[PDB]
Amino acid sequence: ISPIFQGGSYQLNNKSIDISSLLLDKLSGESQTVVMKFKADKPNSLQALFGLSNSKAGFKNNYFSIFMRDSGEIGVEIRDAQKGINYLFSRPASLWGKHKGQAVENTLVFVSDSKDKTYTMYVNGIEVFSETVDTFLPISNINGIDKATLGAVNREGKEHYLAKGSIDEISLFNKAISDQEVSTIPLSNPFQLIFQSGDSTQANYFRIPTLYTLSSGRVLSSIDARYGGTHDSKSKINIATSYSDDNGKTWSEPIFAMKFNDYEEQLVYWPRDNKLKNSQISGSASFIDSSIVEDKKSGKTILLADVMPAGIGNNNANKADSGFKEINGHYYLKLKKNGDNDFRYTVRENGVVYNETTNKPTNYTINDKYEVLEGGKSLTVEQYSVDFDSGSLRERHNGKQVPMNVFYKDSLFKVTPTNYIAMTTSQNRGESWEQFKLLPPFLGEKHNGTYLCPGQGLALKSSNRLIFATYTSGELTYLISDDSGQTWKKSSASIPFKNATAEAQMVELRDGVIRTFFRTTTGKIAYMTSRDSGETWSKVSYIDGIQQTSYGTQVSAIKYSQLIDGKEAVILSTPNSRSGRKGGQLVVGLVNKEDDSIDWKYHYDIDLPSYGYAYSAITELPNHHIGVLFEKYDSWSRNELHLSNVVQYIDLEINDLT
Numbered sequence: 243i244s245p246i247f248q249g250g251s252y253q254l255n256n257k258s259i260d261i262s263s264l265l266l267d268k269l270s271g272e273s274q275t276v277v278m279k280f281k282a283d284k285p286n287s288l289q290a291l292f293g294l295s296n297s298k299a300g301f302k303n304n305y306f307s308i309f310m311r312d313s314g315e316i317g318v319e320i321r322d323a324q325k326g327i328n329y330l331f332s333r334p335a336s337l338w339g340k341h342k343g344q345a346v347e348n349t350l351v352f353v354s355d356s357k358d359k360t361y362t363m364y365v366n367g368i369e370v371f372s373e374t375v376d377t378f379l380p381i382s383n384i385n386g387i388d389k390a391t392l393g394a395v396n397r398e399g400k401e402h403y404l405a406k407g408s409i410d411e412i413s414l415f416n417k418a419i420s421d422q423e424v425s426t427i428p429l430s431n432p433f434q435l436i437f438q439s440g441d442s443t444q445a446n447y448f449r450i451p452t453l454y455t456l457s458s459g460r461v462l463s464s465i466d467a468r469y470g471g472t473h474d475s476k477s478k479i480n481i482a483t484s485y486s487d488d489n490g491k492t493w494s495e496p497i498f499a500m501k502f503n504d505y506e507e508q509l510v511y512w513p514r515d516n517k518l519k520n521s522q523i524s525g526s527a528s529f530i531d532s533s534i535v536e537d538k539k540s541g542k543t544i545l546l547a548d549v550m551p552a553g554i555g556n557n558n559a560n561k562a563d564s565g566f567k568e569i570n571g572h573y574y575l576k577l578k579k580n581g582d583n584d585f586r587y588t589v590r591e592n593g594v595v596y597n598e599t600t601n602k603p604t605n606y607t608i609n610d611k612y613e614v615l616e617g618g619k620s621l622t623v624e625q626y627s628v629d630f631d632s633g634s635l636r637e638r639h640n641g642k643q644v645p646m647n648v649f650y651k652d653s654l655f656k657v658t659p660t661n662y663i664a665m666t667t668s669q670n671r672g673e674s675w676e677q678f679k680l681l682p683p684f685l686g687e688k689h690n691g692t693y694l695c696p697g698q699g700l701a702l703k704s705s706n707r708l709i710f711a712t713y714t715s716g717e718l719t720y721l722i723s724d725d726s727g728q729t730w731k732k733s734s735a736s737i738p739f740k741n742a743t744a745e746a747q748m749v750e751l752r753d754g755v756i757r758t759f760f761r762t763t764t765g766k767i768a769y770m771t772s773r774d775s776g777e778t779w780s781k782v783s784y785i786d787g788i789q790q791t792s793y794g795t796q797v798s799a800i801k802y803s804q805l806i807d808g809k810e811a812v813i814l815s816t817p818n819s820r821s822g823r824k825g826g827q828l829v830v831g832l833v834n835k836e837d838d839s840i841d842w843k844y845h846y847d848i849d850l851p852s853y854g855y856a857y858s859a860i861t862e863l864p865n866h867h868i869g870v871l872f873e874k875y876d877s878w879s880r881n882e883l884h885l886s887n888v889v890q891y892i893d894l895e896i897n898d899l900t
């Protein structure tokens with residue numbers, strides 16, 4: 243259908259534009275669609291892009307508006323005082339501001355549908371809200387409407403919510419266009435989605451992106467596929483992967499590298515209201531925090547992730563037990579059988595479940611998949627599904643049986659409720675993944691395991707050494723293998739922090755010289771250096787010129803392959819901010835060969851200082867461009883939980899950065 247109104251090249255410089263004569267007498271019926279292509283690289287704190295209002299005295303709360311905040315939030319108000327209706331819908335972190343230093347044209351599609359009593363907002367190809375009401379209010383049917391306005395809302399004859407930006411195109415339709423029709427509206431996105439709502443994972447949310455370039459040129463990515471909102475475990479979370487064989491231009495339909503089946507994989511819209519947003523899937527096993535490395539010698543790709551048994555996360559992680567028992571200098575996974583008050587069982591060699599009280603083996607064994615078998619026959623449990631239909635979250639048996647896994651809540655045998663580390667491999671560069679194995683304890687029997695640093699592992703260029711960084715209280719604990727990850731050893735490196743979330747990433751500055759950048763509690767990114775390929779580690783220093791928050795955020799890093807201003811180059815990706823997770827930057831450092839110090843010379847703003855930027859992953863693509871996959875929102879803020887499609891991918895070239 244044609245538009246009833248179509249206009250453009252409107253400059254909003256804190257002066258509203260009156261289009262009432264053009265538009266108001268065209269509006270008819272109760273369903274409308276607004277399509278609007280706009281820029282705002284210097285928004286005011288709070289501004290309206292489009293307004294429909296009763297401007298008369300005493301009717302200040304009769305208007306429709308499409309508004310944004312300088313935090314990147316978008317929303318609408320639909321108010322009529324006489325009808326006693328005051329509707330506000332919005333979603334934080336829905337906008338782009340800048341890309342490569344040019345203002346981004348955001349494509350906004352708002353559908354006001356009177357038949358379905360539903361308001362739907364799309365921005366840059368992403369539905370950010372869809373709200374159904376019991377009492378629909380057509381944006382046209384607001385009492386006494388007499389003004390149509392761009393860049394403000396006219397209330398009692400005055401400009402409210404004055405805007406700074408521009409509207410390249412605006413069109414209105416006296417129809418609620420279909421989801422199908424919306425999909426055909428052309429976009430001007432600076433970004434790409436690799437993982438997204440409705441893909442093969444069926445997770446509505448995603449966190450903790452990774453990126454790694456394989457020697458064949460294939461680019462690999464892993465991520466937390468988060469089902470129960472964006473909450474850290476406890477929840478249901480699988481690890482998913484996707485690859486690109488064309489320098490990041492297109493990406494495979496994702497598959498799982500790590501998954502549990504105790505709970506169904508469900509696409510669920512998690513409540514964002516204050517009473518309910520902290521609802522948590524509370525009985526599901528899960529993974530969290532993946533890290534990737536490629537082993538030159540075997541050609542295998544290796545992926546590690548944290549593992550958590552049902553119910554269990556960071557809060558209630560057994561911080562006094564590794565979950566293994568030492569016997570004769572060997573480690574065995576402890577088990578608790580349904581009905582005991584203690585862990586009276588171990589998984590010895592060949593999965594054989596073994597009674598520790600009697601030292602007699604049982605008729606039960608554990609297969610490669612951590613599944614339970616009795617006399618060689620495989621036991622099952624009934625799966626759970628979740629729903630908010632009763633008003634609050636319910637976790638209910640769903641009728642489907644799945645193999646009994648010792649990480650599950652309904653399992654006859656259960657592991658110790660603490661965090662573990664799992665490892666899987668792919669022989670086909672991420673077209674499929676093996677069953678994972680648990681890594682052994684490194685810090686000992688009574689020490690609960692370390693925490694994987696998400697992102698990349700490090701493959702030393704001049705040898706077969708593989709290193710995965712992990713953290714725990716008071717130290718980083720690097721995991722080192724020289725035999726394609728068959729066996730691992732630890733290299734501990736003390737840090738001056740207790741209970742720090744010390745997510746660390748490494749770059750190889752030259753052959754045998756590793757620098758690790760890590761998150762702290764001080765507001766500065768820290769670093770340490772190894773010169774013997776990770777055997778031993780320097781004292782901690784800190785970077786000046788970049789700010790993080792007191793709680794800090796993960797930082798991603800690569801050694802760039804090409805000299806810049808004639809010097810070795812490292813690239814860092816991080817929020818640059820002491821207030822929140824925003825102001826994303828790539829920072830380019832030039833190495834000083836006389837002392838391996840780094841001059842941080844170029845700062846590249848991914849988008850506005852006020853727009854969200856959290857965890858990230860960077861990689862040098864085979865064409866020497868830079869790929870960035872990142873949380874484009876504040877993943878710390880309690881106001882920005884459970885947003886869909888905010889992990890986004892962009893392509894940069896070095897000259898953009900400098």
Ligand SMILES: Cc1cccc(CNCCS(=O)(=O)O)c1
Nearest residue numbers: 474475530548555556693877878
């Ligand atoms: C439950 C859990 C397991 C392993 C690691 C973590 C850390 N979560 C950090 C993410 S953030 O800084 O809170 O955004 C949590």
